[PDB]
């Protein structure tokens, strides 16, 4: 008895492969109302049709941390900010001074250092330049000259000085990625939704359903709801402190906006440029005043300690408020498309959790209804993108705005985890890890339509 070679075509096989992919997108969120706009650019309208066939008896490996798609769409998308790099106004590429004590407006505002100010040491030192003026809050009063300071325009000292003026759009449109022909996208499913290692009810698609941008330092929001409880994800959960993420059953709300009004006094500044010198004091009495339905927060932590009991046995367990550094590390982050803002995760999140045969001591509170209120910061001059030398003085918007959100998950780190009362904080992570959200469902493969085997059949000669 003996064997020989034979070859087959249409053989069911693929291999995992780095590649680009191309994108479907919303069909009306951009239209002829937004000529040449970056959201209008490139990738195509929406596909209603993504079919599947089942992998009956059949299963596959996954790893959300290893997968390349995080880079695929960390690339492309940030080029909105590259398109947004408008030139500096003629008055302020240099570190100009400003003069004020109370505001140049009719009063300084009801809350904090809003003491609006004229430019003064301003190129020509001339009325055409020094008549022009800015909204104030905080970083705008930084020291220049001596005591009785003529305050620093801080935006000069970094490689890019710019503003993304209000014509630019930031709407979190759902992209629907599809792989090139002969590639395919495989979707993992089981109630064991862990997102690394083997997966059982694995499934096939030409394209993903829609997934949306997000821009948070600590609390993920406004997107993909979980499958029916809560779960935690990590690269190697045995690790001391390496970043952890938590995914939520029920979208607990954040109930606030900062409707402090300043009027639409934009200016065709200098040699025919544009600037947003918003002034006057109608509607000036107003603040962020933020609030949350406490029980709908409380449920998560009081369940989460049980979940953590599976990963870290019997110990008392703890969260503490967010880590120090800049306000951004010190906070959860958002902008409505109206003002840049940073809430105090460094006061909140302070709870310990008992975990013996426990029936006690795991929360903020129990049995009150009531809800809660919380306080939060603003930063109107921003290192507008982290990890780049780019900075902007933000363009304001009038009145209240159509904004509020609800939370899909936590970004998390296990700070201090070498002693009992096993400790954690909100925050950590790469800016990339926003886009981990839902993407644990997927991997990309290349088809390989032929293969070779032994047989008993000896060929003709």
């Amino acid at each position: 008895e003996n064997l020989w070679v034979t070859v087959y075509y249409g053989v069911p096989v693929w291999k995992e492969a780095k590649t680009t992919l191309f994108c479907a997108s919303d069909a009306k969120a951009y239209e002829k109302e937004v000529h040449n706009v970056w959201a209008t650019h490139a990738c195509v309208p929406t596909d209603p049709n993504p079919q599947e066939m089942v992998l009956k008896n059949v299963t596959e490996n996954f790893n959300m941390w290893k997968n390349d798609m995080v880079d695929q769409m960390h690339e492309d998308v940030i080029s909105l900010w590259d398109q947004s790099l408008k030139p500096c106004v003629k008055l302020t590429p240099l570190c100009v001074t400003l003069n004020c004590t109370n505001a140049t407006a009719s009063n300084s505002s009801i809350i904090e250092g809003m003491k609006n100010c004229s430019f003064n040491i301003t190129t020509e030192l001339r009325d055409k330049r020094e008549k022009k003026n800015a909204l104030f809050y905080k970083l705008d009063i930084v020291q220049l000259d001596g005591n009785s300071s003529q305050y620093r325009l801080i935006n000069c000292n970094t490689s890019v000085i710019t503003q993304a003026c209000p014509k630019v759009s930031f709407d979190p449109i759902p992209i629907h990625y599809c792989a090139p022909a002969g590639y395919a996208i495989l979707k993992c499913n089981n109630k064991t939704f862990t997102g690394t290692g083997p997966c059982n009810n694995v499934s096939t698609v030409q394209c993903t359903h829609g997934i949306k941008p997000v821009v948070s330092t600590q609390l993920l929001l406004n997107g993909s709801l979980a499958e029916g409880e809560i779960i935690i994800r990590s690269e190697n959960i045995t690790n001391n402190v390496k970043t952890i993420i938590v995914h939520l059953n029920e979208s607990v709300k954040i109930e606030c906006t900062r409707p402090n009004n300043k009027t639409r006094t934009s200016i065709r500044i200098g040699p025919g440029q544009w600037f947003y010198a918003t002034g006057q004091v109608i509607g000036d009495i107003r603040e962020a005043y933020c609030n949350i339905n406490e029980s709908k927060w409380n449920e998560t932590l009081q369940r989460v300690s049980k979940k953590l009991k599976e990963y870290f046995p019997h110990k008392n367990i703890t969260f503490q408020p967010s880590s120090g550094g800049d306000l951004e590390i010190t906070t959860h982050s958002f902008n409505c498309g109206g003002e840049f803002f940073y809430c105090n995760t460094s006061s909140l999140f302070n709870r310990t959790y008992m975990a013996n045969s426990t029936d006690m001591a795991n929360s903020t509170e129990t049995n009150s209804t009531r809800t809660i209120t919380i306080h939060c910061r603003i930063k109107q001059i921003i290192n507008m993108w982290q990890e780049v030398g780019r900075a902007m003085y933000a363009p304001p918007i009038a009145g209240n705005i159509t904004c509020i959100s609800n939370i899909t998950g936590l970004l998390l780190t296990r700070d201090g985890g070498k002693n009992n009362t096993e400790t954690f904080r909100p925050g950590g992570g790469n800016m990339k890890d926003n886009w981990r959200s839902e993407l644990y469902k997927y991997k990309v493969v290349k088809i390989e339509p032929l293969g070779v085997a032994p047989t008993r059949c000896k060929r003709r000669v």
Partner: protein
């Protein structure tokens, strides 16, 4: 023709049934065979992909020509296969694995196997040709 059964050419759907069984399924899966604006822009990319699928299929079909095979789906050749890498014996292959493990049993040596298929196909002409070349 018809709406897509999740997969186009390559027609993948018997996925990880037994290799022995798959030969029947495979042979059968042969035997049967803005108003207008940005939606017309989109109307290139999938067609361009449709062309790239044809490009791949034809580029890869040419290889079978070099192996002296015509889409005749069970082409065979007296290169021996000769056991010693995964060794299983016949049923113990075809009744166990998926092709999606036969790759993890064997990739690599593939790059020599293509050469065996080339030089053996050239032998299966040469070894007749030289006996005709006696005159």
């Amino acid at each position: 023709a018809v709406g897509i059964g999740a997969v186009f050419l390559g027609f993948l759907g018997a996925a990880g049934s037994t290799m022995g069984a798959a030969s029947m399924t495979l042979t059968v899966q042969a035997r049967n065979l803005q108003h207008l604006l940005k939606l017309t822009v989109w109307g290139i990319k999938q067609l361009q992909a449709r062309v790239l699928a044809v490009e791949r299929y034809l580029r890869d079909q040419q290889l079978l020509g070099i192996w002296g095979c015509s889409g005749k789906l069970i082409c065979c050749t007296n290169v021996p296969w000769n056991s010693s890498w995964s060794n299983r014996n016949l049923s113990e292959i075809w009744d166990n694995m998926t092709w999606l493990q036969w790759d993890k049993e064997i990739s690599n040596y593939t790059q020599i196997i293509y050469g065996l298929l080339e030089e053996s196909q050239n032998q299966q002409e040469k070894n007749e040709q030289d006996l005709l070349a006696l005159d």
